């Protein structure tokens, strides 16, 4: 904890198209998918984004379907592009995100997305941007990176 909301602030620095003001705004996967496209548009391309349904509303079953596709993508990216540098021993429980808006599990998913950004080809620029954020956010991001980069 203290992860989800600091990482929400970080997510907000991408200024994606979908609303990203609240925890609930992240539960259907669309914001996450748009952020991943910004992180690596060569991998998280339009063909991939098309699989994420928009206008989900309160349909938690579709939320979960979207989130499973997002997590699949992250884990494939980690394996195929990042050489397994992100620690994926504990997977976020996307069912609890969909069914209960569980912000702790959401924080874990956001941590994986952070791991993509700080290991992608543009990692220098993502890290430099983090270094401009509020100190309280940077400290949580630091702890999150320590965890995800450890073996």
């Amino acid at each position: 904890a203290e992860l989800c909301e600091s990482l929400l602030t970080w997510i907000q620095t991408f200024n994606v198209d979908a609303p990203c003001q609240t925890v609930e705004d992240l539960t259907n996967g669309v914001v996450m998918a748009q952020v991943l496209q910004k992180i690596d548009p060569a991998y998280f391309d339009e063909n991939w984004l098309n699989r994420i349904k928009t206008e989900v509303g309160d349909n938690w079953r579709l939320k979960i379907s979207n989130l499973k596709k997002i997590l699949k993508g992250i884990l494939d990216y980690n394996h195929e592009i990042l050489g397994q540098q992100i620690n994926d021993f504990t997977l976020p429980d996307v069912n609890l995100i969909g069914e209960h808006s569980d912000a702790a599990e959401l924080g874990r998913m956001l941590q994986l997305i952070l791991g993509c950004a700080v290991n992608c080809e543009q990692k220098q620029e993502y890290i430099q941007a983090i270094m401009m954020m509020e100190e309280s956010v940077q400290h949580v991001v630091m702890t999150a990176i320590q965890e995800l980069m450890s073996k």
Binding site: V118, Q124, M131, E135, H139
Partner: peptide, 14 residues
């Protein structure tokens, strides 16, 4: 907190 910069610059150094 300046030590935060050491952490992030250390990532950049790797």
């Amino acid at each position: 907190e300046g030590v935060l910069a050491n952490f992030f610059n250390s990532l950049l150094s790797k």
